[PDB]
């Protein structure tokens, strides 16, 4: 045998295809494996790997996250690319004129964009507009803003939440939470 430096036969921990059985998503991977292998542009490798991402790693990109991203210096005429869902927002009031490319728009977001002069295209009419990724701006949504991330790492003095079912002054406030009762963690 050999003196094995590192572990043998280890899968690289990245998925190479979606877990889903969506046929209308499997055709988008048949489009972007062609692009990312036969185009030297690095935009297509990004959208290829982003189509495999699970729903937890693919958070919704609200329509204010988009409208903020065009307030960058010299980025109004870009086309925004979101490889998740694009949801509406009733907290913004003026929205610019841009074309957004996305998997799934909601009903409120698709109505808001086309009202404001923009348009909504899917990720296959983007490839005829930008095969190399001309003037795109890949936005992403917040990942650590879930419910399940407030509980990761719960130990003493960490600042994380407890996994709890019902709150109130009777549930998990007494000992270890104040110096009156015992100690304070």
């Amino acid at each position: 045998g050999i003196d094995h430096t590192s572990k043998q036969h280890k899968r690289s921990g990245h998925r190479t295809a979606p877990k889903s059985d969506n046929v209308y998503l499997k055709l988008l991977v048949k489009l972007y494996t062609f692009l990312a292998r036969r185009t030297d542009a690095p935009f297509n490798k990004v959208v290829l790997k982003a189509l495999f991402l699970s729903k937890i790693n693919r958070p919704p990109v609200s329509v204010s996250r988009i409208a903020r991203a065009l307030k960058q210096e010299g980025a109004a005429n870009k086309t925004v690319v979101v490889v998740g869902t694009v949801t509406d927002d009733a907290r913004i009031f003026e929205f610019p004129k841009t074309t957004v490319a996305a998997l799934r728009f909601t009903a409120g977001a698709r109505a808001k964009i086309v009202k404001a002069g923009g348009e909504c295209i899917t990720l296959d009419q983007l490839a005829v507009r930008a095969p190399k990724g001309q003037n795109t701006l890949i936005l992403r949504g917040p990942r650590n803003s879930r419910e399940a991330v407030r509980h990761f790492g719960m130990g003493p003095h960490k600042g994380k939440a407890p996994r709890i079912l019902s709150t109130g002054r009777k549930f998990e406030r007494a000992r270890g939470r104040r110096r009156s009762k015992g100690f304070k963690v």
Binding site: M154, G155, P156, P162, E172, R173, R175
Partner: protein
């Protein structure tokens, strides 16, 4: 789907998944939250601190109907107007016809002050009001009129 469970992959292997040295037995450690401060103590001191004690006064016969006050922020305030009408007041922005927004009929017991509203005069009817959520209304030419 029992054909997908791991009992089906465990036929043949003695001690089906549960080890041979320490077997699978009926309740080692007690039943339930037994031993919370005797032997499972350093679980409850790390993962659920705040257990094992008594804090606060008591409320005999608490009714949750008194403590009904669902909040609303200012950034969601124009949603209470219907969408085919809410833009009409945004375009015209006329002070002699400020649109009445009733928060209580929509089901809210307080209007709070998170967010910025457009500078359109509206009048808002609400049971309870925070100091910023009136300050940002009256700066917009608005009126808070209390209700009930």
């Amino acid at each position: 789907p029992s054909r997908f469970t791991k009992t089906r992959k465990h036929r043949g292997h003695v001690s089906a998944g549960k080890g041979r040295i320490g077997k699978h037995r009926k309740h080692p450690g007690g039943r339930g939250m037994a031993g919370g401060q005797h032997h499972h103590r350093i679980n409850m001191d790390k993962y659920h601190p705040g257990y094992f004690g008594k804090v606060g006064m008591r409320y005999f016969h608490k009714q949750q109907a008194h403590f009904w006050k669902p909040v609303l922020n200012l950034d969601k305030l124009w949603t209470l107007i219907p969408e085919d009408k809410r833009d009409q007041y945004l375009k015209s922005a006329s002070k002699e016809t400020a649109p009445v927004i009733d928060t209580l009929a929509a089901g809210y017991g307080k209007i709070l002050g998170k967010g910025r509203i457009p500078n359109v005069p509206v009048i808002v009817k609400a049971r309870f009001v925070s100091k910023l959520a009136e300050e940002k209304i009256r700066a917009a030419g608005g009126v808070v009129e209390l209700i009930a």
